[PDB]
Amino acid sequence: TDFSGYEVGYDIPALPGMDESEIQTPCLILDLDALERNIRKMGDYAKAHGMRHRSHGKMHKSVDVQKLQESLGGSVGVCCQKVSEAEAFARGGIKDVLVTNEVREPAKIDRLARLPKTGATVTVCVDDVQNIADLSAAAQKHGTELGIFVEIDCGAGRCGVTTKEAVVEIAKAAAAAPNLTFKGIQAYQGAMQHMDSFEDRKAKLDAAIAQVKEAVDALEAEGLAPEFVSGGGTGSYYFESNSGIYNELQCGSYAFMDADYGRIHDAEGKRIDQGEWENALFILTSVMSHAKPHLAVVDAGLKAQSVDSGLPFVYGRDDVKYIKCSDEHGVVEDKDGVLKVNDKLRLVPGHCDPTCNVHDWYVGVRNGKVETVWPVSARGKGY
Amino acid sequence: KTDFSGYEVGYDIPALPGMDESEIQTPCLILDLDALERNIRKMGDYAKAHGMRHRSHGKMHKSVDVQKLQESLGGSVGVCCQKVSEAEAFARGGIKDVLVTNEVREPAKIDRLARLPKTGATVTVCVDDVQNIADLSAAAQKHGTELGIFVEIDCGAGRCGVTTKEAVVEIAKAAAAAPNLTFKGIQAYQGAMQHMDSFEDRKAKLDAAIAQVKEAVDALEAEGLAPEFVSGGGTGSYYFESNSGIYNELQCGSYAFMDADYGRIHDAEGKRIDQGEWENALFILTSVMSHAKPHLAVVDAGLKAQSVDSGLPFVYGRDDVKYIKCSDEHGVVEDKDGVLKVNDKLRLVPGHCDPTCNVHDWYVGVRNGKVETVWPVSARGKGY
Ligand SMILES: *Cc1c(COP(=O)(O)O)cnc(C)c1O
Ligand SMILES: *Cc1c(COP(=O)(O)O)cnc(C)c1O
Ligand SMILES: [Mg+2]
Ligand SMILES: [Mg+2]
């Protein structure tokens, strides 16, 4: 780990060995103990249910976190939303990459078809039979093999096909196409993941499972039984795991957590951040103005995070409240005037994935010290 | 100059100079260089016609190259920066006059601030707490540099700054007395009113801010601390500061690029300011990557390619399709006529330019269908 050329407080927030009080704000810290407990717990859950877990790299965009998910959580590989992101993971040594998305632009397809030359195994999703010919041609050009998932729109309304006939058509084309292998089904119900009610989420996944089952049966009737039936997120994984239809999970956010996931309820009606998953990702911020008696202004505003899923909150205390932000300022209510200039706070971000994607580093803290500083390997890699 | 050898199109840069616009990799940010230059000239000409300095705000674009264009074509007198690390990026890029339009309190940040004049930059910083003066002076003394001081007034935005003329005078006196500091004037930015729809509502808010600033100027003058600069103003207010007789420096930022949330506010003729006053120069370029449903297209620019803090982007230059939804790596475009095909490209006007610029590392400057420039977002992610 050589950080030569970097400058703390200019292009990196900290270096291994620093005390946490020396970290430059605003930045992202990882509670390494809690991260590791989250990773172990999901890996144990998947194993106990006979499920593969392909950890989702779109969330943290970090080769180092993915390697920890593989070593400590038994993750079988990484999921990626974009080809450039996939390539960042493959260049970092990740050996099994699933692009949980469609790739259609010719230069993107060419880059995808080259990726296996890194030594990584590569699978991609398809929702348009016309895409098969392009992928096959590119794989033939580079002398590579690509795996194919057919993506089913099982309720999220994004990409994917909506009938079992469409699924069979794409799978048949994949099987017949040179240098492609039909590997199974992508069916991620992303739209239901943040419903507060466990029973509501169960009902949505019940419907997805029934649709996926019709597709599995149609494929089996054609001699194209899907090796993998892959999906599931931090708000649903128990349902895919109990289904006997899915055999691979794609959970991402559980490792870090955020406020929007944290507030949804488990089967007992308890917030999932109050027992199921721990907060491991925080924005560290400093108070930099307090001219009014009961308002503190901190240095983490919009550009240090996102607000697509609401505001962050101050972690570990309930006497102050993050209520507003502009681009480079956050306004924290301080009704008892207990915050002072240069005090530090930890914020749980509203939404982990976009927050991670506006930073270049994670400061991994343990026992009050900076133990690791990990690059956000795939930040901004949306091509 | 930029060295592109470390980068790779389609992996960590969207394009290279000389490419055809059809070859640009999506999602990315493009700048219509003609429109950008017309916006920059127009603001510069407006400022000069009103005898105002314009200090272009670098927090918006975070680009040394755009700032240099604002100086060369718009007559910008210098840059505004919101954070010390952003200021360091601009000073290291050769920008000669840097105002940090924010307070700097953390000791290591102050130490970094105090070294910035060694780049050749003149450096000014804002103060809203008299106790900050001693820390700034100590660092400047330690490193043999000079720092200028603006006292920040909360003139209605309710962010940083002080709210009494007595507090202003106290800070200014301390700056004047402190070694290696010089009291340079007032920071008074009414950011909260900038996006009110009604020009009349905006005028009234700035009337109140001007009155408060004038009282502070009067109090300073009575103490022998007349402010050399009285600086503020944004893209939604600049005509008020420019006709106030009190402000002498503007800090407009967004006008150069524009976005949807600014574009929708109305001018004194009841028109959207993006329908006459300022042109759209910043676009998100995006490709259709799925069309499995007959009347929906999915594009490759979602939340991670922009922001939604100020609402959705919109499709520019056509009326037959509509960006209605986005997830992290997808945008959903209504296509009720079924005219969009996979790999078609669309230009989106971002909802909010500043946060959108801060999630990308490059601007693809296009002119006459070609990539003329590829400029780095010099200060992306520099929030320290
Ligand atoms: C983002 C994503 C996941 C992981 O989702 P979480 O809700 O973050 O756990 C899984 N599958 C796909 C296809 C995704 O896009
Ligand atoms: C952002 C900002 C400006 C410029 O704002 P626009 O509304 O984008 O033109 C000016 N002054 C300060 C202090 C700012 O923070
Ligand atoms: Mg998410
Ligand atoms: Mg703005």
Side-chain angles (χ1 to χ4, degrees), chain A residues 3-21:
Chain A
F3 295 94
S4 67
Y6 292 107
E7 173 175 326
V8 170
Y10 180 64
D11 55 14
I12 199 170
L15 296 168
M18 288 176 60
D19 189 81
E20 65 188 357
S21 65

Side-chain angles (χ1 to χ4, degrees), chain A residues 383, chain B residues 2 4 7-17 25 362 364 374:
Chain A
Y383 316 106
Chain B
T2 307
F4 296 111
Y7 302 101
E8 175 179 344
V9 172
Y11 179 66
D12 55 14
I13 192 169
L16 294 173
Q25 274 288 307
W362 304 97
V364 183
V374 183

Side-chain angles (χ1 to χ4, degrees), chain A residues 113-358:
Chain A
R114 313 197 299 261
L115 247 188
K117 288 176 177 162
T118 65
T121 295
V122 179
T123 307
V124 72
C125 297
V126 173
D127 70 2
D128 181 350
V129 67
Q130 310 224 251
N131 192 16
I132 294 293
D134 302 329
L135 296 164
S136 179
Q140 294 178 62
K141 169 181 168 181
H142 293 281
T144 55
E145 300 282 327
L146 293 172
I148 301 298
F149 279 1
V150 178
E151 181 162 21
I152 297 177
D153 179 354
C154 56
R158 210 158 60 174
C159 304
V161 298
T162 60
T163 68
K164 69 193 199 287
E165 291 74 25
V167 171
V168 168
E169 177 179 23
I170 295 167
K172 274 183 108 190
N179 294 58
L180 306 183
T181 302
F182 174 65
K183 302 294 281 191
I185 288 164
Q186 172 81 10
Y188 176 64
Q189 222 298 31
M192 55 64 62
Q193 297 288 330
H194 288 87
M195 303 184 77
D196 255 17
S197 162
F198 180 91
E199 280 299 312
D200 280 356
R201 298 199 305 281
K202 186 176 174 305
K204 293 296 183 196
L205 233 291
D206 279 348
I209 289 165
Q211 172 181 4
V212 172
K213 178 175 194 316
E214 291 203 353
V216 170
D217 291 341
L219 288 166
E220 277 177 3
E222 300 286 353
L224 291 168
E227 179 174 12
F228 301 113
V229 180
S230 197
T234 297
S236 75
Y237 62 94
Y238 11 80
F239 306 133
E240 287 89 358
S241 291
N242 170 261
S243 70
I245 301 282
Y246 288 86
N247 60 3
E248 183 171 89
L249 299 172
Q250 298 181 354
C251 308
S253 296
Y254 75 98
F256 285 5
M257 286 298 288
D258 62 25
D260 194 48
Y261 250 133
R263 51 91 184 179
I264 74 173
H265 290 178
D266 67 13
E268 316 307 325
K270 198 167 194 202
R271 292 171 59 106
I272 61 171
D273 65 7
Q274 294 180 355
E276 194 173 312
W277 306 106
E278 296 176 75
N279 295 102
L281 173 66
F282 307 95
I283 303 152
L284 191 69
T285 189
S286 296
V287 177
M288 45 70 58
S289 180
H290 205 308
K292 301 178 171 55
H294 298 155
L295 291 162
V297 189
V298 297
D299 65 359
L302 177 59
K303 286 177 179 176
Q305 62 199 298
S306 69
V307 298
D308 66 289
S309 301
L311 296 169
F313 63 85
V314 178
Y315 183 79
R317 54 195 299 178
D318 297 297
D319 54 342
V320 297
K321 185 179 185 175
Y322 195 109
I323 57 163
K324 292 180 170 125
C325 62
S326 47
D327 282 355
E328 295 285 356
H329 302 84
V331 178
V332 178
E333 292 190 346
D334 182 18
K335 77 170 195 68
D336 300 326
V338 302
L339 298 178
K340 305 308 180 133
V341 168
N342 289 331
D343 283 354
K344 287 179 176 70
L345 299 173
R346 292 180 291 162
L347 312 179
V348 171
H351 189 180
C352 53
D353 323 60
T355 293
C356 292
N357 187 60
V358 305

Side-chain angles (χ1 to χ4, degrees), chain B residues 115-242:
Chain B
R115 300 167 187 265
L116 296 188
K118 298 172 185 294
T119 64
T122 296
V123 180
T124 307
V125 66
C126 293
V127 176
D128 69 6
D129 180 354
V130 66
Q131 293 178 1
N132 193 10
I133 293 297
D135 308 326
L136 294 164
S137 177
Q141 293 180 64
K142 184 70 183 171
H143 295 312
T145 56
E146 299 279 334
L147 295 174
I149 301 295
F150 281 3
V151 181
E152 180 161 20
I153 296 172
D154 175 4
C155 60
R159 196 161 72 192
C160 302
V162 301
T163 63
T164 67
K165 61 188 199 292
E166 292 79 15
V168 172
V169 168
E170 179 179 29
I171 294 170
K173 283 181 58 179
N180 295 54
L181 307 184
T182 300
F183 172 63
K184 287 292 190 170
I186 288 167
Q187 172 75 15
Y189 176 65
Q190 222 298 28
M193 53 66 58
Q194 298 284 331
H195 292 79
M196 299 181 86
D197 283 317
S198 167
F199 174 100
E200 199 65 45
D201 286 346
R202 298 202 303 284
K203 194 263 190 190
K205 292 299 184 197
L206 237 292
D207 278 358
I210 289 161
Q212 183 182 349
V213 173
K214 172 49 156 191
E215 281 198 8
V217 173
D218 290 342
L220 288 165
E221 288 183 350
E223 299 284 327
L225 291 168
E228 180 179 359
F229 303 111
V230 175
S231 196
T235 298
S237 77
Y238 62 94
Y239 16 79
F240 307 130
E241 283 92 358
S242 294

